[PDB]
Subunit: 199 residues, 3 copies
């Protein structure tokens, strides 16, 4: 249905770095090398520039290497750690599809794989949370974004508590889900407690 | 003449959020829902991401809803508040076309409408300010951008004094005007007091 | 080989301003006027917006005028100062092709010209630094970006020590070089001292 199944924006700490990548090929790689082809469907982080860069970020960028392979197949998306260092994923849909806390950050060690989005499991939540409120379904908006860190992990068991603390990370928007979510939201009504224009 | 009649970039406070939208359809909507189609010509704010986000911004984003409808017709552009909360517009051309101070921020309450750019009124200023200086016509550059806030207002009568203080707002560039302005500027000469390269 | 020979992003101080321009025409101009055509292959800085802008930046933007002409021919790229004020270039490849320190910032006074990238000279470095390490060739990544300031200079002989200190400047990525560099890096191996995921 959508021209792209995902889009990916990259950051270094809390500052967006480089253009947004959009994916139509079902298999995309985000690596740390230097090819600029927006076509190909390699998202190459290595040729993103940043003068604000520091040593701990430069070092990390040199260990992304092969990076992450993100495979869209039917309704599911899996992420594979091709890099020689681990990646770390925070997916609310995956944290649900299992049984973890919504803020759970999972490790995908090198060579490993993980379903990070379940288009079915999501589809439920959608319907379950329709007759559950409006803001109920607004929050699902949070499920269609997945955050992923290269090398350095964050949260429970690390010093880094926020993804914005990690040197190299990406944000993945799943356009499939967002479109279905959109269909639902456009047929509903604003929250209760209206909103002040001054405060 | 131009491929797009406008482009719109969105911010939350003082940080740009999301990609720039470009408009070729004469009617565009900027709403708070979650459709990613760059085609359609709905600019959907709800699927823009931000970890730096805070509670007062999240709340506002949930009241944008239907948002603003921006209608380009002949030379004029009107803005219509479809949202259940008001939008606030700062248009130098509209502040002139009327008689307000250039920094005047106008409210468009829900259901209301307002001509925010007058392609004629602008056209005058252009000619009047040609034989009025160069920096005279450089400043017109400021007229081709319009800033607009959702829900929270800013300036006179609010605590918020700068648009950068508002949680959710957009910046609209009118490519029609800019092109005509460009035609004029390329035939002129730099300002008087030349410029130091050290200070 | 690449769809674009360069891309250029603009900044004001340390904040990215406006969209990235991509160049396929061998001759591009970056000026300070107001045409939005992404086609043309004029990159027009004057119609980039910024509320965070200050007086010293506004003044500079008004002296860019004709700006810089960047000519890609065969393997070489030359930069010509069309502006009435000088531009300042930091090109690691040019600093090498000559004999300067890598951080050397060169002035191109109005009317002047300068080869800022030598596709041959680069080609050497590439091969020389293959059997010289991996991180050896990773650093070449730094050579394919060129930073350029309008009017105000930076570094040795000025108060401004960092390009991020200059009010108006651009970052140019040479996609030719990056692609060849990419070919090389994808056939190699990560650095020695592996990397901690916690620190």
């Amino acid at each position: 249905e959508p021209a792209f199944w995902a889009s990916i924006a990259y950051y270094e700490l809390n500052c967006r770095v480089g253009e947004v990548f959009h994916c139509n090929n079902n298999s995309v790689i985000v690596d740390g090398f230097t090819n600029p082809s927006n076509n190909s469907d390699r998202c190459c982080l290595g040729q993103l520039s940043n003068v604000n860069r520091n040593s701990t970020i430069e070092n990390t960028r040199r260990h992304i290497g092969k990076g992450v392979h993100l495979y869209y197949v039917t309704g599911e998306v899996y992420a594979e750690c091709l890099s020689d260092s681990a990646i770390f994923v925070q997916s609310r849909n995956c944290n649900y599809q299992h049984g973890f806390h919504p803020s759970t950050v999972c490790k995908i060690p090198p060579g490993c794989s993980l379903k990070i989005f379940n288009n079915q499991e999501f589809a439920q939540l959608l319907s379950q949370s329709v007759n559950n409120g409006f803001e109920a379904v607004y929050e699902l908006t949070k499920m269609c974004t997945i955050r992923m860190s290269f090398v350095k992990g964050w949260g429970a068991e690390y010093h880094r508590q926020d993804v914005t603390s990690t040197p190299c990370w990406i944000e993945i928007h799943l356009h499939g889900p967002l479109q279905w979510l959109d269909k639902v939201l456009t047929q509903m009504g604003s929250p209760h407690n209206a909103i002040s224009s001054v405060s």
